[PDB]
Design a protein around this ligand. Sequence first.
Ligand SMILES: [Co+2]
Ligand SMILES: [Co+2]
Lengths: 620, 620
Amino acid sequence: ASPFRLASAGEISEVQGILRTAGLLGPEKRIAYLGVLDPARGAGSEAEDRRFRVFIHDVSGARPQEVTVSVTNGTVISAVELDTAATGELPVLEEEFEVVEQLLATDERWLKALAARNLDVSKVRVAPLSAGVFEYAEERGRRILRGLAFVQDFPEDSAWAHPVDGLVAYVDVVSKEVTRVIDTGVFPVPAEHGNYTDPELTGPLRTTQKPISITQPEGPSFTVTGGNHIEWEKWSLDVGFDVREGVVLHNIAFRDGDRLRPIINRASIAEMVVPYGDPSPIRSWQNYFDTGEYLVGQYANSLELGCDCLGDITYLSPVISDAFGNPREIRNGICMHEEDWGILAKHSDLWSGINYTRRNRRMVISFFTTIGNYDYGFYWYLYLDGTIEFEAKATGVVFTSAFPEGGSDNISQLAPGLGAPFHQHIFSARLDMAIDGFTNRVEEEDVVRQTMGPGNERGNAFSRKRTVLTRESEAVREADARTGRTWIISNPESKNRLNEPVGYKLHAHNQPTLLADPGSSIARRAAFATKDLWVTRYADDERYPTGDFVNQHSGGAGLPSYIAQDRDIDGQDIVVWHTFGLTHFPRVEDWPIMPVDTVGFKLRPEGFFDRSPVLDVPAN
Amino acid sequence: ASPFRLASAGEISEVQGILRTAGLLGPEKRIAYLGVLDPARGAGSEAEDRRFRVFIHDVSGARPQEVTVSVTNGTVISAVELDTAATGELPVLEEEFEVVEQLLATDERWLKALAARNLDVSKVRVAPLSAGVFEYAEERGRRILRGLAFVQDFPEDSAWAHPVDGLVAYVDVVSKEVTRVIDTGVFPVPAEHGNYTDPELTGPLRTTQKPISITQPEGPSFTVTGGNHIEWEKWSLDVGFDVREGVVLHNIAFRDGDRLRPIINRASIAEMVVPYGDPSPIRSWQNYFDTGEYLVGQYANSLELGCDCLGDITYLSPVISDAFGNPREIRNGICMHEEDWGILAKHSDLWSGINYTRRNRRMVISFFTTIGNYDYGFYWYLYLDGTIEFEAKATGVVFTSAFPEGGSDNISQLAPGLGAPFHQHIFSARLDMAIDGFTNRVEEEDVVRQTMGPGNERGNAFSRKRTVLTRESEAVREADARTGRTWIISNPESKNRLNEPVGYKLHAHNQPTLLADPGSSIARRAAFATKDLWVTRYADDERYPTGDFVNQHSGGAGLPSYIAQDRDIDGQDIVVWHTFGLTHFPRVEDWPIMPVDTVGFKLRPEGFFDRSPVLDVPAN
Ligand SMILES: [Co+2]
Ligand SMILES: [Co+2]
């Protein structure tokens, strides 16, 4: 029924059948990406035509294709051949990762490098990483992966504790060729193990932690209909899932009186990049575009009740396509639950003698993914007062290297001889705004200090100013914590009872953005990460801040090219792109496994309501 | 037996007797402050002499006194006559706030102002506020309070909805006379009511919230001994309470194997200032020093189980003195409980086939206080991984005024004719550091960007830099969100296994600091609020960033004066003073009662341990 329902296993099988029937999915073809297309703006067709977009890879080297099909009509709507050397390679296939270690195991240069280090090839694991775009001419038109070595002493050993520095290989996963084997010198392989489940390292386990029971006798306060339509404490929304972006929220609206008021049409993390700041040739090319190159949704974990999600949990099990077009279910990949959130409002009034206390609550929608050594949790929160918040949780095992004798300015020491290259975790939240409708605008709000003098004799006055961003060219903004800078998305045509445009204020954490030199390959490929906020005019084909094909793709697509159109964004259908991230210098406390570190943002109502919208919350 | 135990009702009664017998507690005398003194540096002094510090006010105008008494020996250690015109006035007595409304009620000027506005004096509540500034010469060393009027239509009515603008009066609480009544003009008194418990405003109460049951079948994981000594998941500390500072944490330490390692000797909010940015002569003097002038501990609320504190809660009922030396218990004034805090660490490793997930927990110690229209929650958190965090929760009813016809640049509109003056809530956390002992130092850490070139050909490198603050004259620092600036407190004499000085990193929220003009009275009296971080050499008499007698003091006292000593802080007994606060531009959503807003800071271990200290946490 709902045109925002999750993709079904049947729809995926249908896409596969349509492509096979069209002669677009023979045995040499692979599905590198498959996702349902969101409905276009304005009710076009009488009914909703379900469409899917697919990126088809060819394991023989032939040009890949981008195809859109209608599962309803069983037809190919469009099919275009992709010139990858220009517009970018398709996302890495899970099956291509295993090609690397296999190939390298039979390469003489690789074997000689390991022998020189007295390492048994059978114990050397290879982390196959995205290649990016650098100065290797031969890589032009080649689907490459770069492998870094780690030693695994036994089946359950954490190889991350044993990096093999000074060695890196480049592999053509299609032609099955080892293009280069670079050895800059033999580094001792860190000896200490990092097995956090080994009693030897954990010591006796604590027995002091008493149980905390969290339960809901009458069940959760939220309802799920149509498979993914949520309704909770005045909130309404649809929980979507995409193999690339992961959890995506649609039609976020709030019930205000006899009307459902829209706030955000679509919210997602459109991209996330993890750049490493170690100038060593062995890793200076290392940049993970987890969303764009790897597809975070593809690796979403199956969440365990009691371990990952505690309390009364409602799960969603999204389906994605495998490399052959077969539907694959990610069992319990999405957790949904509400949780108490302390005090909401409170006041003990002397004059009236009335004491008032109300508790807060938040709806939680999340999933967790694993990208090699790291694991990322994506959490969206909805609060009773109308606030919307996102939080990324980074944990797992830090990427390691050897720690050089003379010390390092770009690597920290975790254990004897064990290093941890400095890096960042930067996300891009794409917020297709719809504050009381699509006619929106963004204002940059800065606190304003005033000089002591006439009209401000005591020098206590301070104000604020709001600057409307009217054109895309003026909509690339930077954070300014010192002036309490925030951004307000309002609707100039919808006013509250005080005759003021209704709006929502975006509060950023104001963390450092991309640190790389502006001329670096990464600064260009991850241009979005160089600025805190971008505002574009909505367009069907502007989905990711890095464009559709990130893998081995130069700059040229994404936000910078969108912005150039310099479209009108003052009272129009707009999209806010917020960059936020973590800057890491790994501590010894982060080894052998790092505790969760968080970063995010939130939007709170700003004159959206006519008064507090939580006066109807009971005392219970 | 602990020297850090909470003051008993008996100790306060004993202080009362000692003072009375010494002839220091005559009919005209009042106790403006009474608190137990912390042990001096030096455990050599076997058997601690329980001493109390007392500020004795004289309602007759006679000079007040500062008296130290030994409850152990039942004697007066010392009694010094106070010169308020020089060192400042004593905290405001609750009985004094009352005299303001009573006096004005018989003043012809006040009655005429009300008559002109057709306001029945019996329905006009007067908010008694501190002088706020220092200027008016005529206030010749007079103990004064200012009064702002609010109309309360009926006993259970919220007067805050009906401010009487254009009117303000000054009163000498000791001579009991109205020195001035300023009427700058009639402003309509906002008509709408702000009664959040009135059905006509709340509408039908929601019935959609299902219960969330949080219980601990085997009880809490923390233990309380000696009445206030807490032990929880390796943490050890003493929870103290002062009528001025509220909850104070003592001897915060962490059990690292065989030894109990100190981190922070004493942690507290030493001061809290609420400056208003409305240039109107009616409020341009408005500045609350909740901690220094009002004493936040004095107005601590009794926390209701199931409303203010949910789950398995352990309470502490601190005792304070009233204006006459009688002990008054604040039943359930302090809440203590542990709570689940999501995922602590997680990693699904492909190579080892091991999936690992651990939950996090936090120990919570808090209290709530009410200052007129506002209510503040002070929360301290201890996490499993060794992180310490503080969080202030601001809620209650916003201070109101009339909303000027024609708008305003320093006041927002909450309802028809109802305004909310812009203002800030700025706290000062006093952290008497003790990282593995008292020999500490502070380093400012900034992220460092690097230029592409030799040694960084790909332009991907980035580093960090640390600068030791060696003298107090250079220990007045500003935040810098852009360079991810943090401050590390380390012990140059205690190193981790990597031969690195152990330490803790302070992460600030980087919110705007005091916005008032540098030449304003408030900028002088609350100089601490103009900079994010101060570092001083420990001194027994350097307790508050604003000095001991904040009320009506000319300014410069506190931090600016301490810092002026320019003492050595490089590897010494030091104290960190962190300024953090909220800047508020009240929204319609904040009326009639505002949702909790938060601000705080946290300290995370930085090479304090030899590896993660939570590897011994069980899976459960
Ligand atoms: Co990291
Ligand atoms: Co406020």
